[PDB]
Design a protein around this ligand. Structure first.
Ligand code: HEM
Ligand code: HEM
Lengths: 150, 149
């Protein structure tokens, strides 16, 4: 945990404050789309659709996915410890139900894929898009590692 | 089967000069990326136990260099061959007894250390964005194929 906290903290610190601000801006403005786009693409997969069947979970997961994206992409130094606890909780939920790891990680790949066009279509410069995308990818990756290994 | 189409589509939808620059970045810095991969990875105790002796080090570094170049210089015809590689690597990791969460940790390190190399290149910011995008997606799809194999 100590090593994970330091790395995630370092990721936020080494990320330029205007870049983290723009990443947070991208998150808040498009988290709703990213969540609903995530859900349908995932459910296309037969192995994944069996877990995303009912309407109640849909409304719950979309809201939770939206909150998750906002928390991770708008992460500050103070939020690092809390974010780690969140990934543990999510890991418990996925384990409680019995959702395979390779299916969840496929979702992370889906999430990272649909995030890029949103950043690419943003009003920012090419250099800023690169740094926002870099911070976003590393943040999602470290979050995935914490969730998986928990 | 779907993995082939997605990896093929990834190469097709990627601009040829971008993939060329990504391939050039690979060839020029794969040697550094491999050694940088080793140092960061061995920090983790669970991973270090597999990377103890010097002989294993040299092979993984050599294999990492070839892997990075092959994946980033991927053409459409190479896609099927690349998938076969991931199966072979997965068998090796299984033969040794390397945990899945440990291998994926290596992928994160690889994607992490790749960014400064692309960032410090002589290309434009726009080209760097697309090269980095193609590189990340290529490594991600390769990881999923390797993991499920
Ligand atoms: C194929 C991939 C995935 C599937 C099928 C899946 C499925 C589920 C299901 C069925 C639940 C239970 C929700 C409920 O009972 O109301 C859940 C919870 C949750 N998942 Fe996933 N999940 C996937 C990947 C992900 C990813 C990639 C993330 C974040 C990046 C994520 C974040 C969450 C969160 C935040 C919750 C709710 C946590 C809470 O309520 O405390 N999931 N997931
Ligand atoms: C912590 C992460 C990892 C560890 C500790 C690890 C360890 C190893 C070891 C000990 C070998 C065999 C070396 C030998 O027999 O001399 C090996 C094989 C190999 N690994 Fe990994 N590995 C990791 C992750 C990865 C990743 C992320 C990649 C690629 C992105 C990769 C690609 C390969 C390749 C291409 C080979 C050799 C394939 C062949 O001989 O045909 N490994 N790994």
């Amino acid at each position: 945990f100590k090593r994970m906290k330091d790395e995630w903290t370092g990721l936020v610190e080494q990320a330029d404050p205007p870049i983290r601000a723009k990443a947070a801006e991208i998150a808040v403005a498009h988290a709703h789309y990213l969540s609903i786009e995530f859900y349908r693409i995932v459910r296309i997969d037969p192995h994944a659709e069996e877990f995303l069947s009912n309407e109640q979970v849909e409304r719950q997961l979309k809201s939770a996915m939206e909150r998750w994206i906002i928390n991770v992409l708008s992460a500050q130094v103070d939020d690092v410890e809390r974010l780690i606890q969140i990934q543990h909780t999510v890991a418990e939920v996925h384990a409680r139900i019995g959702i395979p790891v390779e299916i969840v990680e496929m979702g992370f790949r889906v999430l990272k894929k649909i995030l890029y066009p949103v950043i690419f279509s943003s009003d920012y410069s090419a250099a800023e898009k690169l740094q926002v995308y870099h911070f976003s990818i590393n943040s999602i990756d470290i979050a995935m590692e914490v969730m998986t290994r928990a």
